[PDB]
């Protein structure tokens, strides 16, 4: 069953983030105008650029699949919780329910968090620094942008559920804090890995690795008080 379960769960999950990705296509034109906005009202003098000379759709396709993969999410939570709970950690059913609901609730707060805290905040590092406009006033890509925006809220939408699934294993006597607080410099080589990932230059890449930092630290915590 431990096999089996993994592999079975996870086509639904598939099967959820392509029917999501499919649902949110139709709707892909008013969140890029959604996402554009951001960009739009901080720095007006800044145009969008459409790169080669026609890639329209890729946008579309990027966004639609992002938040496809973000409507999702309380089914795949939902079968992630379902894979690792009734087998062996908790055996109690009852807080299944406010584990779940609490993953999802740090699901969209970890999005919301990177949309409203991160990204004007990553703009602020890139383009909003003195009379550097002259720089750019049409001078930037659509894809780049968007992409980044993307990839910087599905990220953290991910990356809010650490605490909690870090407060499971540290209650299950899995994880100790010790080892968390002894594994503190590795986590930073992966904070700036996923940076490096989603995060087009040096600035950007360590501006979102602080709140990686921020929320192992928040882990640690939550690990001695699971303890005690």
């Not at 739009?40 to 145009?47: A, G």
């Not at 383009?127 to 780049?144: I, R």
């Not at 992409?147 to 499971?168: D, H, N, R, T, W």
């Not at 986590?187 to 996923?194: K, N």
Request: no cysteine; aromatic share 14%; proline share 6%.
């Amino acid at each position: 069953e431990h096999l089996r379960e993994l592999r079975y769960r996870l086509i639904i999950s598939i099967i959820a983030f392509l029917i999501g990705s499919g649902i949110a296509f139709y709707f892909a034109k008013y969140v890029f105008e959604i996402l554009a906005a951001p960009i739009l009202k901080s720095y007006p003098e800044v145009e969008l650029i459409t790169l080669s000379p026609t890639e329209p759709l890729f946008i579309l396709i990027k966004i639609s699949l992002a938040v496809g993969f973000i409507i999702a999410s309380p089914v795949i939570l939902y079968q992630f919780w379902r894979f690792i709970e009734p087998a062996l950690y908790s055996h109690e059913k009852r807080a299944f329910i406010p584990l779940l609901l609490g993953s999802i609730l740090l699901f969209m707060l970890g999005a919301l968090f990177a949309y409203f805290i991160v990204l004007p905040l990553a703009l602020k590092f890139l383009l909003g620094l003195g009379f550097t406009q002259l720089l750019a006033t049409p001078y930037l890509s659509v894809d780049m942008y968007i992409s980044f925006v993307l990839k910087l809220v599905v990220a953290f939408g991910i990356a809010f559920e650490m605490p909690i699934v870090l407060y499971v294993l540290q209650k299950a006597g899995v994880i100790t804090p010790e080892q968390l607080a002894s594994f503190r410099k590795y986590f930073i080589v992966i904070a700036f890995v996923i940076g490096a990932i989603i995060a087009p230059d040096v600035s950007t890449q360590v501006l979102m690795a602080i709140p990686l930092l921020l929320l192992y630290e928040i882990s640690i915590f939550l690990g001695k008080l699971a303890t005690r």
